[PDB]
Amino acid sequence: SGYTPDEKLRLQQLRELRRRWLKDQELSPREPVLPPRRHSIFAFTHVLIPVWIIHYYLKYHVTTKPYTIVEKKPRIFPGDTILETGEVIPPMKEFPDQH
Amino acid sequence: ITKDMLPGPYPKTPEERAAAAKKYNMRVEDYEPYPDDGMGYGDYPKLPDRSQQERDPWYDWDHPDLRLNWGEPMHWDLDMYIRNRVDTSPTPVNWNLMCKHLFGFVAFMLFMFWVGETYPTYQPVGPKQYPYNNLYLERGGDPNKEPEPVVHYEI
Amino acid sequence: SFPKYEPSRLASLPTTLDPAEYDISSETRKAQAERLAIRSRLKREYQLQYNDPSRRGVVEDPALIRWTCARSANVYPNFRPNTKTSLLGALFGIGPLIFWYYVFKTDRDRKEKLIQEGKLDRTFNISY
Amino acid sequence: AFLPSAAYLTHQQKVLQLYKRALRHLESRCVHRDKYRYFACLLRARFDEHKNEKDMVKATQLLREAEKEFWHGQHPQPYIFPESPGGTSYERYECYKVPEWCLDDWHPSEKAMYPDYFAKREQWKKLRRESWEREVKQLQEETPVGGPRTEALPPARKQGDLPPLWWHIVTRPRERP
Amino acid sequence: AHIEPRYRQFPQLTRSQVIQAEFFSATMWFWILWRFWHDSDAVLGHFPYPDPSQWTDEELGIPPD
Amino acid sequence: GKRLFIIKPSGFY
Amino acid sequence: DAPPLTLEGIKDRVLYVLKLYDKIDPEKLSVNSHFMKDLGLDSLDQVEIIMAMEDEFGFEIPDIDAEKLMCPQEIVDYIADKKDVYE
Amino acid sequence: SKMELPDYKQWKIEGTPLETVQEKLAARGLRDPWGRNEAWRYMGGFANNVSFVGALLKGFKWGFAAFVVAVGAEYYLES
Amino acid sequence: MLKYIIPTMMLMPLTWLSKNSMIWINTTLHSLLISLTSLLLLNQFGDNSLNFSLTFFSDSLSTPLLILTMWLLPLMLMASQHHLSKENLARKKLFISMLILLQLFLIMTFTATELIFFYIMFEATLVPTLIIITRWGNQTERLNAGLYFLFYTLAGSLPLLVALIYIQNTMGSLNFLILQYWVQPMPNSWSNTFMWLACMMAFMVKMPLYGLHLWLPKAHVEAPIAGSMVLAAILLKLGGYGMMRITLLLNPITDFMAYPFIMLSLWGMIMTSSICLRQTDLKSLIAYSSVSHMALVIVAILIQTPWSYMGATALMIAHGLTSSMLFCLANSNYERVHSRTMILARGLQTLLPLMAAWWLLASLTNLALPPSINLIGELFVVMSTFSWSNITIILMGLNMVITALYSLYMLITTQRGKHTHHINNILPSFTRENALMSLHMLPLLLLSLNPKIILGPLY
Amino acid sequence: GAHLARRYLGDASVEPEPLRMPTFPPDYGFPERKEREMVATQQEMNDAQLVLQQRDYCAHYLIRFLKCKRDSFPNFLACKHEQHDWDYCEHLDYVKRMKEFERERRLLQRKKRREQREADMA
Ligand SMILES: CCCCCCCCCCCCCCCCCC(=O)OC[C@H](COP(=O)([O-])OC[C@H](O)COP(=O)([O-])OC[C@H](COC(=O)CCCCCCCCCCCCCCCCC)OC(=O)CCCCCCCCCCCCCCCCC)OC(=O)CCCCCCCCCCCCCCCCC
Ligand SMILES: CCCCCCCCCCCCCCCCCC(=O)OC[C@H](COP(=O)([O-])OCC[N+](C)(C)C)OC(=O)CCCCCCCCCCCCCCCCC
Numbered sequence A: 001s002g003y004t005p006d007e008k009l010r011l012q013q014l015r016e017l018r019r020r021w022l023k024d025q026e027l028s029p030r031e032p033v034l035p036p037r038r039h040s041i042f043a044f045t046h047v048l049i050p051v052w053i054i055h056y057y058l059k060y061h062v063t064t065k066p067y068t069i070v071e072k073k074p075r076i077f078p079g080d081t082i083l084e085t086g087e088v089i090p091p092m093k094e095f096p097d098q099h
Numbered sequence B: 001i002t003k004d005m006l007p008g009p010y011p012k013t014p015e016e017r018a019a020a021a022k023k024y025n026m027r028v029e030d031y032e033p034y035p036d037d038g039m040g041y042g043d044y045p046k047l048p049d050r051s052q053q054e055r056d057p058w059y060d061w062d063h064p065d066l067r068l069n070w071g072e073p074m075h076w077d078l079d080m081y082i083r084n085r086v087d088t089s090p091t092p093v094n095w096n097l098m099c100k101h102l103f104g105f106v107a108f109m110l111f112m113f114w115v116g117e118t119y120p121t122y123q124p125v126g127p128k129q130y131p132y133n134n135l136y137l138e139r140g141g142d143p144n145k146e147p148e149p150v151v152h153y154e155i
Numbered sequence C: 001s002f003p004k005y006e007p008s009r010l011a012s013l014p015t016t017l018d019p020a021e022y023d024i025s026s027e028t029r030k031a032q033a034e035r036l037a038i039r040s041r042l043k044r045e046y047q048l049q050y051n052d053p054s055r056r057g058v059v060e061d062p063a064l065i066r067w068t069c070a071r072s073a074n075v076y077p078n079f080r081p082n083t084k085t086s087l088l089g090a091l092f093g094i095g096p097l098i099f100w101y102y103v104f105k106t107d108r109d110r111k112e113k114l115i116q117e118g119k120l121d122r123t124f125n126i127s128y
Numbered sequence D: 001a002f003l004p005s006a007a008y009l010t011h012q013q014k015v016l017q018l019y020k021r022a023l024r025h026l027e028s029r030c031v032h033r034d035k036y037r038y039f040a041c042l043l044r045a046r047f048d049e050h051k052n053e054k055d056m057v058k059a060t061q062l063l064r065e066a067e068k069e070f071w072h073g074q075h076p077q078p079y080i081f082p083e084s085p086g087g088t089s090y091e092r093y094e095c096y097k098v099p100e101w102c103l104d105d106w107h108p109s110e111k112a113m114y115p116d117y118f119a120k121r122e123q124w125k126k127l128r129r130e131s132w133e134r135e136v137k138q139l140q141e142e143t144p145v146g147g148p149r150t151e152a153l154p155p156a157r158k159q160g161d162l163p164p165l166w167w168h169i170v171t172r173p174r175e176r177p
Numbered sequence E: 001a002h003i004e005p006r007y008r009q010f011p012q013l014t015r016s017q018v019i020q021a022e023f024f025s026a027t028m029w030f031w032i033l034w035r036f037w038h039d040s041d042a043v044l045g046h047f048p049y050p051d052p053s054q055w056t057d058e059e060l061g062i063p064p065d
Numbered sequence F: 001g002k003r004l005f006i007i008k009p010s011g012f013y
Numbered sequence G: 001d002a003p004p005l006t007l008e009g010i011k012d013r014v015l016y017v018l019k020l021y022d023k024i025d026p027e028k029l030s031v032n033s034h035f036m037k038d039l040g041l042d043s044l045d046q047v048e049i050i051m052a053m054e055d056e057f058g059f060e061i062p063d064i065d066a067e068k069l070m071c072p073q074e075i076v077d078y079i080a081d082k083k084d085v086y087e
Numbered sequence H: 001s002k003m004e005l006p007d008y009k010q011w012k013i014e015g016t017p018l019e020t021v022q023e024k025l026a027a028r029g030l031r032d033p034w035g036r037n038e039a040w041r042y043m044g045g046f047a048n049n050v051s052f053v054g055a056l057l058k059g060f061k062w063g064f065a066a067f068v069v070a071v072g073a074e075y076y077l078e079s
Numbered sequence I: 001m002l003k004y005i006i007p008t009m010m011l012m013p014l015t016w017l018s019k020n021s022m023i024w025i026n027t028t029l030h031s032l033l034i035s036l037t038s039l040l041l042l043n044q045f046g047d048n049s050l051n052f053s054l055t056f057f058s059d060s061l062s063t064p065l066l067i068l069t070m071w072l073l074p075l076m077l078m079a080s081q082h083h084l085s086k087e088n089l090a091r092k093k094l095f096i097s098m099l100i101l102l103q104l105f106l107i108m109t110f111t112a113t114e115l116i117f118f119y120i121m122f123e124a125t126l127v128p129t130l131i132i133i134t135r136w137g138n139q140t141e142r143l144n145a146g147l148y149f150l151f152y153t154l155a156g157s158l159p160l161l162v163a164l165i166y167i168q169n170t171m172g173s174l175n176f177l178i179l180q181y182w183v184q185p186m187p188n189s190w191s192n193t194f195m196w197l198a199c200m201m202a203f204m205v206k207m208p209l210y211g212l213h214l215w216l217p218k219a220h221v222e223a224p225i226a227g228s229m230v231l232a233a234i235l236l237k238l239g240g241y242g243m244m245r246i247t248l249l250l251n252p253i254t255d256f257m258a259y260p261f262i263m264l265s266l267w268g269m270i271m272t273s274s275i276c277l278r279q280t281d282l283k284s285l286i287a288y289s290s291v292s293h294m295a296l297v298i299v300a301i302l303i304q305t306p307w308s309y310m311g312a313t314a315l316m317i318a319h320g321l322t323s324s325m326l327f328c329l330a331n332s333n334y335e336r337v338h339s340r341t342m343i344l345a346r347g348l349q350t351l352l353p354l355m356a357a358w359w360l361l362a363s364l365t366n367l368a369l370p371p372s373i374n375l376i377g378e379l380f381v382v383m384s385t386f387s388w389s390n391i392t393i394i395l396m397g398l399n400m401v402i403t404a405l406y407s408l409y410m411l412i413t414t415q416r417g418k419h420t421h422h423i424n425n426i427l428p429s430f431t432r433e434n435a436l437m438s439l440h441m442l443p444l445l446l447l448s449l450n451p452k453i454i455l456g457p458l459y
Numbered sequence J: 001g002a003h004l005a006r007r008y009l010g011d012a013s014v015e016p017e018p019l020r021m022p023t024f025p026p027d028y029g030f031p032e033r034k035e036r037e038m039v040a041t042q043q044e045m046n047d048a049q050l051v052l053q054q055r056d057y058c059a060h061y062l063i064r065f066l067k068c069k070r071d072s073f074p075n076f077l078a079c080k081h082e083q084h085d086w087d088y089c090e091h092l093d094y095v096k097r098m099k100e101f102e103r104e105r106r107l108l109q110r111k112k113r114r115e116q117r118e119a120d121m122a
């Protein structure tokens, strides 16, 4: 036994009203009624102008203050030459060749 | 809202108990207050401590997220038995057996990590050998002192 | 045979394994019908106000008002100082105060004794 | 147990619910469709064995030990449908189920953006408020003394009446707004 | 045309997804075979593990006493 | 094509 | 994603599943065939029909709504009510 | 809009493991009612699905062919 | 300080001579002018306080409390003008007069060079607060709440009167600037013990201390919105201000007198925060959160280390802004559901998205999300109390769990979940209410950019 | 890994303990045993900023490999021979550590047989 005839009649009437409501949720072709309202610009406004701003800020406000941009000194190998000095680092001791 | 629909003292006569059950909108044979030991419950019903998760989810509730109706007497800990908090729902494994399995598994794992720490594994090698008196200046030794001569040999 | 389900405080008995669910006696039928009647009356009384187009506000639930009044206002007029409330109020009220007092007092006596004797490493400690 | 219309579950309904839950938890145990198909026909045979038991005491006892059988032999994480309570997508879109009365609180610059929709909504509200008094006097003339016994609602009886307490069933939001 | 849903049968496949999937599967097996051919020691081993029993006592310094 | 009205609260304010 | 259902499509798929059931002859079946009184099916068979509807359309019908669907038309109407078709 | 379903008569369970299930059910006096409902999963383009080592070795033939061509290319390139 | 006292008193003719529809706009405009003028108090030096006269000075402790106080009046006027719109015009002007008079007492409470004048203004702040609560509170229990608020403060402070007059007779002066240099070490005796208690328990009640805090979940809840804003945001912080002044005179006895009260706070912030996990009244949840946050300020003042005073005054300013905004949010929902039950109105992000974002920001600042000054004060107090004892971090850290737990539960109960069906009077958010939320939150987030102005006299 | 069974399921008397060894003099059994020659100067690997683990007796091949890897950027597949030299010399150092371990094991066997010969003697 399924629904009673009262419950069947109520579900049919509610079904009719529900389908009427859901069909009346649709839009008109005029709706929505709206009010009356350069190829690499992303490479310019988002890359290049922040590079300009940050380079100015680092170069003339951050590097002008002591120990703000502290950098690890570059790695000196036996056989290198200093750019500020010219003193060639002497190479390593001759190897006890293994293979 | 009025005074005789607000909670009152603990019912001691059966007609006051019936008036309390009529107030809390529930049957007199279903109405059970908290035991009068002086904890401030008064006539408030002792509902059987079920979480709101255990309620029938397919029912057309008045409050679907709380799974609770209008006029229904709330549990004293209704803020505690919401579905965002303490769940009393039945679990397929017994609670005591779950506690046995969890405590035994955790205790066995801790004991076996202690066994592995007491008897650790290693490789069949010597110590790693470092030059310059076991790297005295590199480890932060002061150069005005002088360490004992650590000398490694060939093999 | 099978291991029987043990209900706990945090793991209730299922409805299907409950024996009192299977009571076909007529007094349980009257209880279930009377509970259905109370719930149907409250449901009707709710959704008459809830579907009313003239209503624009809060359908006040006296169960919720009654619960919030029971949690706050009715606690002290239904308090009786007896043995149970006194032992639970002195065990849970001034118990941990005593506990943390002796813990922090013992720790600070130990730390001050180590500091004034030159034992505690306070080498770079200059923020305090 | 807890039903809106009936005050209880009958023995026949308890057997049907045990049968459905046994097939679902068995399908959770029996992932592949042919293996579940075989064992589901075996479980149907077990349910069709004790079908014609006339002693309600013996039938209730068999149902009770069958529930014990099921509780010992259920899947720990059974299959749940996604929009079913406990599923991964259950009550997911409740944050988009905005009620209808919020449309009454719009500014006129965004009500005029949809002229036909609100011009059609006004006759819904009109039909609702002139159906309301007829369906209230329908409810207070049909309900027995002592309140309604069950939570069931009557249909519309006349040609022109709408069914009583209909607005929050018809104007509920869609499940996918 | 876009993929239309079907009922109780195998869905419509694009040629493009099949040739992309087969290209990356062949790329996976090409890379595995390439790096196993050239390296061959990151899996099997780089240097031979010596046997410590095979070392004589003369190089390990054990005077027989 | 069968565009449905999305009910949302008043985002004007 | 998620193609919208219609009443005709739900009807075709419901009768399609019921024609694939060996205890139903596909020459007698209509949309209004009561399962217990026209097709003569058992209550266990009606539960299996509702479960095949669940596996067909991918959502669960609850038991209080499962027990009251006694023809294919009420099943199509229930799936229409729970899917909001012909919006 | 309108979607035309395939025929309900074509999904027969001969040639499927549903046939084996019906045989092992009818060996003990049972009968399977929902075989033709499940018959689409084991037929059509969803029949003859690959094994696990067949799933892992997808594109192993073309990858090995490109491997042999590249090894021959670097063998010719050194000389 | 007389460039601030006289405009605050000229706010009385500005509200009693105004046209009947202009009495909110004029008072809002000129109180915002006074709040813009308040920035001149930021002339602070690393050595000397900004010393104006024999009666008034302002160091870096009193300056942020003054700027917050003079800022809070326009926000209270915006908050309290909706629910007092049906009020009589004379009682409306009397309410504005009580707010102006309370600001007037507060700005010369924080600038009192001398401590008995501090006492007179400190207890003068009771009477407009008492009248606002017991006159424009909504429910029945405003009368009882005003009784508890009056008689905890007076019972704590009438021994403070005798103690301060004893200091005037013994040391010769109650000028704070003199007592910076004439302070004697307070030895161990029972007389000096009750000297310490009489100097401290008034401010213990005003903070509030745990166990003595029973006035506050009645006084803050039964008040109107302006009363709750000024009670949470300023009137609790009189206790921290007064303790930071008066523990100058209580050394080295505080070093062994603070031990019970620190416990009462270190346990109290565990209890009251836990109470916030079970509060059905949302406004009471915010009240117990205020108790839980001021417990840290009590601990930090009683351990009297520099990091503790910096963190305690940062926590005072930050909690003033955050708690005032949380009370205003609770009012913004009370003016739509006409109840304070937190479980009643749910799912409010589905209906009010920007107001839900203001709830989100106030809850994140409540749970001390870095780099807010909430977290700066919270963190610095936790640093100093780790230096005090290494075990306190447990009572700190568990608190920082529970402080998160009710801060998001308040966000999940009210704003998230399924909306309540039957409540349909949920209006869209007014421009006034969002203006109130933004004027709370935007100064609070701007103070994360430059927090050194809210870190006290020993930055 | 069989030494785990020889030390745990066996005895710890004849097995060398890992953390404290060598427990013998290095001259005990070696006539004229030469020292280990460190190739890289301490200032050279100071300026090469090597990790303190990496400053072992075979750091000079690593210094050559890092100099190559800097000097061959972006061709990051062009210093395989220097890396192979460093890996081979690390293998040689590992072999020397294995020789020290086997030396300690054979000396503890020698002491065990010595004390057994002394116990059977008198
Ligand atoms: C002195 C000059 C200073 C200039 C710079 C100012 C710097 C910021 C100051 C504070 C800004 C607050 C204003 C925005 C939030 C409040 C309003 C709002 O929600 O509007 C939404 C709306 C956009 O959303 P919508 O779709 O329209 O509606 C919202 C939806 O309904 C649904 O809403 P929703 O939930 O989807 O959207 C809200 C969303 C929700 O997102 C969240 O809640 C997540 C945020 C927390 C986690 C992530 C951040 C964690 C911390 C990292 C960042 C700080 C450190 C970084 C530094 C480096 C590392 C140290 O939040 C945001 O989108 C805000 C992004 C920025 C967050 C900043 C941190 C706030 C978190 C809480 C406190 C944390 C500690 C303090 C930090 C203080 C920082 C200054 O925004 C506006 O309309 C903006 C209006 C203009 C705002 C002006 C603000 C400044 C006013 C000051 C005036 C005087 C000085 C002059 C300067 C003026 C500058 C313009
Ligand atoms: C909010 C409720 C709680 C409030 C708590 C308030 C503080 C608790 C302690 C207060 C003690 C009373 C004031 C002490 C002032 C001390 C000033 C001073 O010079 O002291 C040294 C003086 C010493 O005298 P002297 O200074 O002249 O002596 C010269 C110095 N020697 C000692 C060397 C000779 O102390 C006293 O004379 C007495 C001090 C104790 C007073 C005890 C009576 C009051 C009991 C407690 C009442 C508490 C509040 C009651 C209400 C509660 C709620 C209803």
Ligand SMILES: CCCCCCCCCCCCCCCCCC(=O)OC[C@H](COP(=O)(O)OCCN)OC(=O)CCCCCCCCCCCCCCCCC
Residues within 6 Å of the ligand: B083, B084, B085, B086, B087, I277, I394, I397, I398, I401, I405
């Ligand atoms: C390096 C060492 C590592 C050591 C690791 C072990 C140490 C820690 C020990 C465990 C502590 C944490 C675990 C216990 C609390 C977990 C609480 C929680 O997450 O509850 C979740 C629960 C809902 O969960 P669930 O039911 O799964 O959700 C799906 C819905 N059906 O949600 C709810 O019920 C809501 C609850 C809200 C209120 C929370 C109340 C509990 C708060 C507990 C705080 C504990 C603080 C401990 C601090 C110790 C510091 C030393």
Ligand SMILES: *C(=O)CCCCCCCCCCCCC
Residues within 6 Å of the ligand: B121, B122, J001, J002, J003, J004
């Ligand atoms: C001796 O066994 C040294 C090796 C390290 C300790 C034992 C590790 C056991 C697991 C690795 C080998 C697994 C072989 C299947």
